[PDB]
Amino acid sequence: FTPPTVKILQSSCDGGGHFPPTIQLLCLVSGYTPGTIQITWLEDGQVMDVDLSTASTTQEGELASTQSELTLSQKHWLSDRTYTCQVTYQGHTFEDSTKKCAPRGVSAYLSRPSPFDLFIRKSPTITCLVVDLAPSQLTWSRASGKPVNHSTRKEEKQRNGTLTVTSTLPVGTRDWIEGETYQCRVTHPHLPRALMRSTTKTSGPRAAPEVYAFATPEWPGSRDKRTLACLIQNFMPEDISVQWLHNEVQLPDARHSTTQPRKTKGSGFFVFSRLEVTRAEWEQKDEFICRAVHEAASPSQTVQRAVS
């Protein structure tokens, strides 16, 4: 045998979130061995008018179904009343209630190792950022069970009445290169089922980038300043770092500008680097190295090209 089950559905809205002029609720009594059944509707506990609801019983095979539809106006449905559908099955009554749909949303971002931290610096770090927490324990994990280097948990509340928890986990050099996977989970007193943020190596293949460096000609009225444009394209995936070098010393990131990686016409991504130089720099040494750090480059994940 099989006892019946009860479910309630409401009418849908439009693209603008507008309720229809007549709101309709449905009470499903599906999947039950044929037997005596009677549906009764309630409004905050009171039995509604019998002429407002219609009940149709359909029998299919060994199970039975019973449908009950109720048409209400928008003013009555917007009253936030508790409408209970009480269906009786041979003495066993099942109930279910509904009401008009009346906080803040949690989010989390887990950054990936930057090419500078993994190959040039040699101290790769990931950042598990969790935002929009109600101000009132972080739990890291690894996929291979290897010894997890501990992280610094920086818990700081935000200005919008929320809380942010920054967790920077140091990882190994060879581990991320060989495709290690890490996961991040935070626990809060008001959490029944926590969420998970898992970072790993990119699913796509690898392709070394091609670096071309050009020097803009002297523009009329700008004899003491040149612009250096560097094109780096056809590299997969898009995670790449760019830096410039003059006189064997690396320039800060504020002196150059790099665009976001965008797809090429076929396969790979392309970026553009723009460095502004003065006449004292190229007369000191007319050589500027446009260096690109990518996981697919080799041997030391580095590809460069100079321009005069």
Epitope: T139, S141, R142, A143, S144, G145, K146, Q183, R185, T187, H188, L191, P192, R193, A194, M196
Partner: antibody, heavy 120, light 111 residues
């Protein structure tokens, strides 16, 4: 990577059987979990053995005491020697690999599975 | 830790939805998460990993599979039914020892 088993066949009751599993593609000493899972003919599955990269082992309550499992770093292969074989011990042994998750494992890679029939 | 699934054998039409319930006598919700796994054992081959922690899909598994539940009761949902899914399905728990598998569900197709 792939997990291939070897060493099955026919063994007399109570005897000793040595089941091996030669992994391919990943060094067994690089950090992972390697388990043994058996399945009775026509019944469900059951775990029995486990071994990590550093040497930590564990044994299921239904088969503990009759089982000896060890690893070999030189051949990327770990064995399962088992004594006191019973009639209800006949099962298809699968060499599987698990993945870590906050101290809980799940078998990702599954071997080809070898059938060991204990009878007279 | 006894586990059970239902039903045993069912015949469903091509393209329908399938519901499997892995009922456990042990609440596995710990550390703010649930630890329950699902598997697909093709007939006469090695079981295939589907869902881990009863919520997250295995990398490479099609989107037809969807798992739900927490604590003691879990539910499995199939979106669209393809003939490629004829197999027996078991659920494995890794919360506490001994690690136990389900009873199995032989899902065959009606056509």
């Amino acid at each position: 990577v792939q997990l291939v088993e070897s060493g099955g066949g026919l063994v007399q009751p109570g005897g000793s059987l040595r089941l091996s599993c030669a992994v391919s593609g990943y060094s067994i000493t690089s950090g992972y979990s390697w388990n043994w899972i058996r399945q009775a003919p026509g019944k469900g599955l059951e775990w029995v053995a486990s071994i990590t990269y550093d040497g930590s082992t564990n044994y299921n309550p239904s088969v503990k005491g009759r089982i000896t499992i060890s690893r070999d770093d030189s051949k990327n292969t770990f064995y399962l020697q088992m004594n006191s074989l019973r009639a209800e011990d006949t099962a298809v042994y699968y060499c599987a690999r698990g993945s870590h998750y906050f101290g809980h494992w799940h078998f990702a890679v599954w071997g080809q599975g070898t059938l060991v029939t204990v009878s007279s | 830790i006894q586990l059970t699934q239902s039903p045993s054998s069912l015949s469903a039409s091509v393209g329908d939805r399938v519901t499997i319930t892995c009922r456990a006598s042990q609440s596995v919700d710990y550390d703010g998460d649930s630890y329950m796994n699902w598997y697909q054992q093709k007939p006469g081959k090695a079981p295939k990993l589907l869902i881990y922690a009863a919520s997250y899909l295995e990398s490479g598994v099609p989107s037809r599979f969807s798992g739900s539940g927490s604590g003691t009761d879990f539910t499995l949902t199939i979106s669209r039914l393809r003939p490629e899914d004829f197999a027996t399905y078991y659920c494995q728990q890794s919360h506490e020892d001994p690690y136990t598998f389900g009873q199995g569900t032989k899902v065959e197709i009606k056509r």
